[PDB]
UniProtKB/Swiss-Prot annotation, chains A, C, F:
Homohexamer. Mg(2+) 4 binds at residues 68, 72. Changing residue 68 to A: Impairs PT, but retains the type II TC activity, converting GGPP into copalyl diphosphate. Mg(2+) 3 binds at residues 68, 72. The lineage of its organism: Eukaryota, Fungi, Dikarya, Ascomycota, Pezizomycotina. This is Copalyl diphosphate synthase. The gene is PvCPS. A motif (DDXXD 2) lies at residues 192-196.
Swiss-Prot record, chains B, D, E:
Isopentenyl diphosphate binds at residues 29, 32, 61, 78. Homohexamer. Mg(2+) 4 binds at residues 68, 72. This is Copalyl diphosphate synthase.
Length: 296, 301, 296, 301, 301, 296
């Protein structure tokens, strides 16, 4: 009697979708839906279920963008101010979490038994991977290539494989496209690493202190030199430093090394595609063009 | 091949649950599982489904602690350092969100469909709650009291009700328990509020830290709205004061406004409501529940 | 006997006039004396009294420049380092206050009974207006247009109307030029607001957290969006953010809106001028050119 | 029209006087109006003109507090938070400068011409005082003692003399009281100085805050200039130390320099001067004034 | 000419030695010159050469304090402020490195060639010691115990051995004393370690400041390496905590690991080694030395 | 028995030479060896001893670079990140000190009795000079020209005269080249001062708060103005301020003044050279070219 359980208004949804709505107003090179469509050419998910799966994966991406941006101490997103630079860590991060739950509600519309178990094991692997990623960031422990690639097969594999596992579970075609999306996600990540140092903020995951792929090669190649790892430890907003670091990693030939690794990996993903295609699936031109876009 | 995918190891789990484990090696006030016992007097969920409901709420709660401690900018949890002052807010936050994943995975062990609707609707409401709380914090504009109470119904009711609704789900009795457990949650948070400012809490979660953090809490809302034309307290919240003198002044002011009396009397009326409701339930084919009122009485000052 | 009351040396005046002297060495688009002269064409204050009134209004301007610069967390003044970036908040602010008192001493040379009451009611209105201006800055309460325009009719009206009220009180002509200087000051302020976001620091009153005229229109137009008001709350020294904010306020058409308001206001000030002129005063070409300079 | 000018409202005054009101809900040592009573024994200004002189000095003083607390970077006024830790230095400063305007408006109620010359010349001197103080602070160069005393004559004498000169103005007796009241002001500040470092002040305005702030105060000037070749103390001021250990060390050092004895003895000679002067006045058609020496004696350690 | 080179003045020396002098007006535990006496029982260096050896070690040590206080980021030396909180890390560092120059100039007074080889090899080792210490600090990677002990042999053995080796040099007895004095240095630092965390030190050099500074110290190395899979303590070091609650938690944890017992027992075995060695020396044409074991016993808990 | 005194590995020398090795990988206008060679044309130190003296002076330079960079709050060294921006104040500074000791070990190879006394008196004078330099930095006491020139004859004279005194002590020629290297070092320093404000970080010893030669002239020329000394006190990373300061020092004609002082000083060093040469030494073309390089 003393408390009248008030209803959820739309102004309060607006307040809660704000860091998210904001992120969704910023144009970006959406490659996630592109990956869904090019794999749909093989799966043929109905359009209602495929609509639902697209909605959820997009929500999850923007929500983890908010979160990870907070956790990375990132400054810029899609060229414009990073969400929490406007709404603050708290509000923006709770909004990340909120959209996670709203996406769970969404998944439930697929009204498929195995949907929730897949969504779960994906979130488990997401945070497994970015957990170790941080465990290394915070410890100044340079991992191995193999350690880095296992954590990537967790962290990026998470939403890539989520999109595809949901599709496989909503289709008629029982072909395991996930050992391919795993390779594609690993490649996309290595690519994202490389471009973060050689492209056109300038070297922003040096400021993050990340142990990215060419950073690991550079560090382990000559261990006797501890400038690069100390610059990782300094988390530098200065560009004199970041530029020195680019210098040192060039002097070690780690971008050469990374481009070679990307080359051999695109090779493995080509043979892995041509296998499926030569087991009776339509020639995928779309995924060829998409994989091609991963290069610089 | 080149990349050979390998398996998750136990050392790695230990790293992932490092903030959460820590936070759980810390003595707590047990008031989740106690309320579960209080209601299981009536619901009588089997011991196994109950063991799962209890791990799910224990998890979701410890995770909520890990994450709120960062969002609120808290200095001490359970009198000990917040986890993120040991692991850093990044690892503490990923460890929270990981454990949330772990609970969703665990709550499937019930193999109960309606349970996932319950779990979702809850997390949804929990975040609508913390969202309106944050929104009135960062905007430095005082809610009303009705607004505060709805926000609390969401935030703190969202896990009282999760536990009791999972129980109802695994039970078969057709009696709604949820208005009562919501009422208990609102009381728990009003009490929690008062106690943050008026119990030597001041050793567990710091000297009025609801002030350093800037929450518009129930007594703070009273004091602020009682003399609108006096801005010292709301301005004080703005300044998010780590300093003890400022918090002392705000406490003194808040006494001047007869706000702690107001709080006590509200919790009085609400406990009357909680009793009248236990009694109305009990009077309908249910057993005299004692622990359910032992706990309500252990919400008190 | 133990204390010899020492005299005021010139080296100590030099120490005290320092933040002020500094500000007076920096070239600026002096529009204040221009406003005095163009109104003098109607008042004809003798040259001794007009000299005195010019001195005092100039002192008051530079002193409040010092003060307000401190209170705004401003960084640059007339392109060069803001006074307290050199002498510090304390010294510079006491020097503001010191010049306030020296100007009071000055006013006393007008040896007119009503001079002090006018100077007072002007300072009262000054701080009345900038008080509410801050009360809003600190509270994140977006005011109305009407609230903003009343506070401007205080805060800028203060020294504008001080110049003119002193002149009216030193002249023979008993015509109430103040309901016109009020409109002129309001216009000058709205103009100053607009130029602070669309001109050539870049958007520095976003960094100040101000609720300026186009900022208020932008915020109230869509309340459902709280990015701009949150960016006001973030007080951003970053330019990515300030530029986003310019973007959002363009997308709302608030510079269009402000230019329209300025247009209608210049209209009212033209009719308000033409009235006085068509009541037997010489055609003021100067104030026409001065009002014209307020536009961009 | 478009813009319609409206009127100032009472809620708005409440906002403008929010820092000042606060600062005035704080218990003070009354030593302004007491000195006014001490002299009104002799001046016998009517009760109404005195009521105005007293509001003017009460205002100018509370405003001076609001503004000095920001300029000095002080942490506590009257044992309670500085106003600007509640309203922010911007509002606290505008509220100060507003009240200064309010006093100038009020001092016209005397309808006395010479009073405005008095009020001006005062504010002028007050700022020449705080100006030389700030100038020796920021330059980290020690004044002499004579230099310090002239600065104090300006800064702290500028409102003792404002009150007593407004009184003389509303009176008609042709006796200068001002050298005595200046002398009393210098004593008040030397005392104030010592007391900042040597009285459990340490609870009102913090543990030697004249150190955290870096004022070259009378005992600090003695200690610094006494052993020029030892830089620890002046360097300590430079470091503007919030830390208690550093202030403790500087206090210990300052004892080693027999600087607090020096202070006490100077205040002794000056009280002798103040008595001899009260006596010389009294001996010239004036009444034995007791409160005037009760207050001088209440300046003491 | 234009430039006319002039001479160094005494006021200027006073400026150069301002941090060092300060740091020397601070009460110390004397344990350098005491160990010198302990050995001069055996070496019997003349009083004059000894006076020089003692000034050289007194200097090199006080300088090492000035400079380590900056490198470690320490808050208090000998319970009083670090010098660089009075003069600034720049002057404190130049004053340190100046005094090092002063010792090199002074150690020539011995007019002993082998002494410069000794002095060099020492400073060399001292910096190899502080270097590996810093290297394991900034990399946040725990040494082993053997690694820690070698680092200590360098850092803290480098001035025990400097004093005793200068003595051997000015003596003529052909007995190596250096393994024993190295052993004593390792004990001095293990003790120093324990004592930093377990003696009310907490008043001299702050509440576990070896924690705020992040040194991997002997008990910290034990606790960290004892449960590798538990990261709280090493992560705590990372956070370099000025806060008392965090240091309290790390201390409690470190007890849970039976690390202070481990320390005590190691210092037990090492004191056995130091005795057995004094006894083996003594048993070879040397005198029963008592002060040499009085000091070893005064290393104790 | 419980402790096995382990040996010094090369990986640990690598750890300790790191801030130093780093500094030695950065190309710079090495003028120090140039000064040794051009004076060797007069001294003829054998090549073994001259090798040793070159090694030690180079080590001492890089080590004090590390140190002074820390003490100056410097940001950039030879265009690239300053050592402690990578390894931190502690490690880098201990590495400075370490190389000081390693250089002492080196000097010992000259196996000359007077080498150590010279090395000492040089370090004594080094820190004597930079001591007073700081004593003034920290006190906001502007020295005199004479005071500044005595401290420079300490601080820079230190390593210049160290190089030359070691050479004189290793040669056959007993001619006091030190009253000349003193003048050359003073000139090099004044030059370094001037170029730090008028060249191509921008005015970085204003940020350091230094009382450099033209800064002293500017400050003492008009004492009545305390903007420049207050900007020295503000230690400004902003460029608006540093640029204002350049403005003020131009308006005082202190770069004119410094160039004139440098002119008269190069005159004295020419006559001081021509004296030695006209006492029977080979015409030094090298030192003429070297002295010429000090000008801009």
């Amino acid at each position: 009697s003393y408390y009248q359980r008030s209803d959820w208004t739309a102004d309060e949804e607006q307040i809660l979708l704000g860091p998210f709505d904001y992120l969704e107003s910023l144009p970006g090179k959406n490659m996630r839906s592109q990956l869904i469509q090019s794999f749909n050419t093989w799966l043929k998910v109905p359009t209602e279920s495929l609509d639902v799966i697209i909605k959820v994966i997009s929500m999850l991406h923007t929500a983890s963008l908010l979160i990870d941006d907070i956790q990375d101490q990132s400054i810029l997103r899609r060229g414009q101010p990073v969400a929490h630079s406007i709404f603050g860590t708290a509000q923006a991060m709770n909004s990340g979490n909120y959209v996670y739950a709203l996406a769970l509600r969404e998944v439930q519309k697929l009204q498929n038994p195995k949907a929730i178990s897949i969504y779960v094991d994906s979130l488990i692997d997401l945070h497994r991977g970015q957990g170790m990623e941080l465990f290394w960031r915070d410890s100044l422990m340079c991992p191995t290539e193999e350690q880095y690639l296992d954590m990537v097969a967790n962290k990026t594999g998470g939403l890539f494989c989520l999109a595809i596992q949901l599709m496989q579970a909503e289709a008629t075609i029982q072909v395991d496209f996930i050992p391919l999306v795993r390779l594609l996600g690993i490649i996309f990540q290595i690519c994202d690493d490389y471009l973060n140092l050689k492209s056109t903020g300038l070297c922003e995951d040096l400021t993050e202190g990340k142990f990215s792929f060419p950073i690991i090669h550079s560090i382990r190649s000559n261990p006797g030199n501890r400038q690069l790892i100390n610059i990782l430890k300094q988390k530098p907003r200065e560009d004199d430093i970041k530029r020195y670091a680019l210098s040192y990693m060039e002097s070690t030939n780690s971008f050469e090394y990374t481009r070679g690794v990307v080359r051999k990996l695109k090779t493995e993903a080509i043979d892995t595609i041509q296998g499926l295609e030569k087991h009776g699936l339509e020639e995928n031109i779309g995924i060829r063009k998409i994989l091609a876009r991963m290069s610089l």
